[PDB]
């Protein structure tokens, strides 16, 4: 990947934003002052490996620094956002050089789960402790950490799971897994953190904040969970309740059942015999019927011209395109065999 | 060692003197003289109380033993070989009990020589309840504290402690560790106490306390210091007197011993024959206190003039002291040559 990352430093206590660079004799470029131009040292290796495994020739990711203040020298928090990965890192200084203390990472910030299936959010983390921690530790080793999972409700935070000595809260059947990669006494430690949500319903999609609590440190990553569901498409004719045949013009109803995203659903009518041809006649779409399982339904109505003898054996079809479907879409059809006297 | 232990269940509260009734500890023969509440069939899974009796010296007398209300029962077994403290939990008829905590020392009355290092050695065993293992994520032996205090009328004096060391007085060092760190079962551990260059002011009663979560174990030790004196005999006289007026008068010097009491000086005239305690006026000087706590002493004897028959014999002072063998120490000066002229 790239060895340099451009970025901007913002002041949270506003009421601005300065440029800066991050180097992962160096390349000079004197457009930055030695206060936002940081040369990173990642002995834990979680930060360098992220850009090493970065896709070849991918666009540059968004980034932002802030002045972190530990609470129950200086500290620079670096947040990096990209469709490839989302990362949070802590840096301590001493081009100004800095060392990476804590790093939280995820390589799937946009997980797309199918309705009714289990969702699996994955992150990892790495911690490099100062000498003060090992020197003061009776029987040294990896520190105890907390792992909390919240979902933003567009104006409200809702805690779902938390890896704990018993003060958790488990909602919607979610479970959290978290573990250091080893219990060695020294050195930086790396760990995995996963979040399992069962039988995901569309009321659970959105922003997921995953928080790592180190004794005096914080890390936060964001994920965008999206749900999709392919529709079930059917095509059947006739109209009304107790109406005589032909009283109303012949109608073709293409019904779509149980699809979630409820947008970009395009319905189309074709006639396949004599080669194919786009269907003729009046056409419109019904109103959405919202279900309880999150999904919705729709009806497309087509009034075609009378059935001519040349179209015997030919079939009418409704094709459908939707983001929860491939480029070919999904199709349903009815063949004019023993049912063409209705539409003629 | 013994297979059964006779004891006494003591009571207080009333303040009219210790009320006591018989009782025994069976490590089942019928005991009628003992009430069924005081006849305990002890169960020691940690094996500290039981092993102390299996390794007990053969033919040794029955050690003193008394239980007290801690229905928590606390067993205190005392003997010149061991001092033991055990806590029992309850659940003809025999009340069954289980040993939970046992703190034990095999040097209850250590005797150290002045200037040497003393080593107070204890051991302890802990049988946890199931509620402790059931609530331990990553389980194992619990962290404990081991404090050391020397008791004397005035104030409690904590000398050393196991690190929770925030003590360390008089150069003392504390040693404590579980025998292993296994997750389950009862655990055993040791607890040694080091005192460098023990001086007479460090004598007294030492209390060792085990600090377990919601538990307390205690034993007492009686550290005593001794110093064998140096004995010597020589002719001497008074200083602020008239020239030649004072009689000859021998001098027995008892140098550098600590236990000031119990030391007596005695005189003899070894050659009728050799058996002849010396005759004449005798007295004892004052105690000369040294910087190391030991004391010194002078013995005096004004014997009669030596005749030509006492030639070849010799005078001697026998020194007896608890820090000495039964024969004591003896120093003699000979009545031959220039000494016969002085005496």
């Amino acid at each position: 990947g790239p060895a340099v990352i451009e970025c901007w430093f913002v002041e949270d206590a506003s009421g601005a934003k300065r440029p800066g660079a991050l180097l992962l004799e160096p390349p000079p470029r004197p457009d930055l002052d030695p206060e936002l131009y940081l040369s990173v040292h990642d002995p834990a290796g979680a930060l360098q490996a992220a850009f090493r495994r970065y896709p070849r020739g991918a666009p540059a990711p968004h980034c932002e620094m802030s002045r972190f203040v530990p609470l129950p020298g200086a500290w620079l928090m670096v947040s990096i956002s990209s469709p490839v990965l989302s990362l949070s890192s802590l840096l301590r200084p001493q081009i100004t050089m800095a060392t990476v203390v804590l790093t939280v990472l995820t390589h799937t910030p946009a997980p797309r789960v199918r309705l009714g299936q289990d969702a699996l959010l994955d992150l990892s983390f790495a911690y490099m402790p100062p000498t003060s921690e090992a020197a003061s530790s009776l029987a040294p080793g990896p520190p105890p950490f907390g792992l909390e999972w919240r979902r933003q409700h567009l104006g409200k935070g809702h805690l779902l799971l938390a890896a704990t000595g018993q003060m958790p809260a488990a909602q919607e059947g979610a479970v959290a897994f978290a573990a250091w990669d080893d219990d060695e006494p020294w050195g930086p430690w790396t760990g995995n953190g996963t979040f399992w949500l069962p039988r995901v319903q569309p009321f659970q999609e959105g922003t997921y904040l995953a928080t790592i609590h180190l004794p005096y440190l914080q890390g936060q990553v964001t994920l965008e969970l999206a749900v999709y569901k392919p529709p079930k498409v059917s095509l059947m004719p006739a109209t009304l309740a107790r109406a005589a045949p032909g009283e109303a013009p012949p109608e073709l109803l293409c019904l779509v059942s149980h699809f979630y995203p409820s947008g970009g659903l395009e319905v189309e009518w074709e006639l396949r015999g004599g080669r194919s041809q786009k269907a003729e006649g009046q056409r419109w779409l019904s109103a959405l019927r919202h279900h309880s399982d999150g999904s919705v339904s729709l009806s497309g109505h087509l009034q075609p011209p009378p059935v001519t003898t040349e179209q015997h054996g030919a079939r009418y079809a409704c094709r459908i395109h939707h983001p929860s479907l491939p480029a070919s879409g999904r199709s349903a059809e009815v063949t004019l065999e023993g049912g063409l006297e209705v539409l003629f | 060692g013994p297979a059964v232990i006779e004891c006494w269940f003591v009571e207080d509260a009333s303040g009219k003197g210790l009320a006591k009734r018989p009782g025994a500890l069976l490590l089942p023969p019928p005991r009628p003289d003992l009430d069924p509440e005081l006849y305990l069939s002890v169960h020691d899974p940690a094996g500290a109380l039981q092993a102390a009796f299996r390794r007990y010296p053969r033919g040794a007398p029955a050690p003193h033993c008394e239980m007290s209300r801690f229905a928590w029962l606390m067993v205190s077994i005392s003997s010149p070989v061991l001092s033991l403290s055990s806590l029992l939990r309850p659940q003809v008829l025999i009340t069954m009990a289980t040993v939970v905590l046992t703190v034990l020392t095999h040097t209850p009355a250590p005797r150290v020589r002045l200037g040497q290092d003393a080593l107070l050695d204890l051991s302890f065993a802990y049988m946890p309840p199931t509620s402790e293992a059931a609530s331990s994520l990553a389980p194992g032996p619990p962290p404990f504290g081991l404090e050391w205090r020397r008791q004397h009328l005035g104030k409690g004096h904590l000398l050393l402690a196991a690190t929770p060391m925030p003590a360390a007085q008089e150069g003392a060092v504390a040693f404590a560790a579980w025998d292993d760190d296994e997750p389950w079962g009862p655990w055993t551990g040791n607890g040694t106490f080091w005192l460098p260059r023990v001086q007479p002011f460090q004598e007294g009663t030492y209390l060792a306390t085990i600090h377990l979560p919601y538990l307390q174990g205690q034993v007492t030790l009686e550290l005593a210091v001794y110093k064998p004196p140096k004995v010597s005999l020589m002719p001497a006289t008074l200083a602020r007197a008239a020239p030649g007026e004072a009689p000859p008068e021998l001098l027995c010097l008892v140098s550098h011993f600590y236990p000031s009491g119990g030391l007596e000086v005695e005189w003899e005239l070894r050659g009728g024959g050799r058996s002849q305690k010396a005759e004449g006026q005798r007295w004892l000087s004052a105690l000369r206190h040294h910087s190391d706590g030991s004391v010194s002493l002078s013995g005096h004897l004004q014997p009669p003039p030596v005749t030509t028959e006492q030639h070849g014999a010799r005078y001697a002072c026998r020194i007896h002291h608890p820090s000495l063998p039964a024969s004591g120490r003896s120093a003699e000066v000979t009545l031959e040559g220039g000494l016969e002229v002085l005496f």
Partner: antibody
Amino acid sequence: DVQLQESGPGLVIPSQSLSLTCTVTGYSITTDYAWNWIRQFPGNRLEWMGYISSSGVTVYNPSLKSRISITRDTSKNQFFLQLISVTTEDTATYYCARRGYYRYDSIDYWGQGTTLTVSS
Amino acid sequence: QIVLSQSPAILSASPGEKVTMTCRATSSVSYIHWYQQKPGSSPKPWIYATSSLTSGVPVRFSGSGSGTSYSLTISRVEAEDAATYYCQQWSSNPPTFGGGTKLEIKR
């Protein structure tokens, strides 16, 4: 009689999560005796996984901590095993079992065992 | 992680010989427990606390050992004893088992 009964599907798709269940009768899982999960791979290699400890408190094998979750149902005297993102290396015979809290205590009661394979 | 190793792996015996398998631990261990497993069934608790037979086990079985080396002995083997025996410890955080020792009967 304190018996144990494993209950599982027997088949799971790779990268999915399995859920096993152990129903014990003649004894309450809230009095004593840690309740464990042990699996035996093809080739007869036992491996302890973890336990729930009669009062909650899960203890896991360090090699599986990032992938294992054990819970219990007090009202039904059941406890469960959950493994996440399974692979072909996870197919084995899974046993639930009882174990006391002391060093002389053995795994005194085992279940009948359920076979579980992972394939398409 | 304490590793247990069972030496005989497989051992043959005619109905009537005295046999012994061993379980050697990498570290000191207070107690090692044994389990008899026949094919198709769960392992049965055979002896606990190194040398204590579980109720129902014939008295012709016996366990011994200490610290780092242990053993299991059958005074006279029996056709009904054809199975694999596993030794297990719980002195460290992850309790482990041995690779097993199958007892094949000669006939």
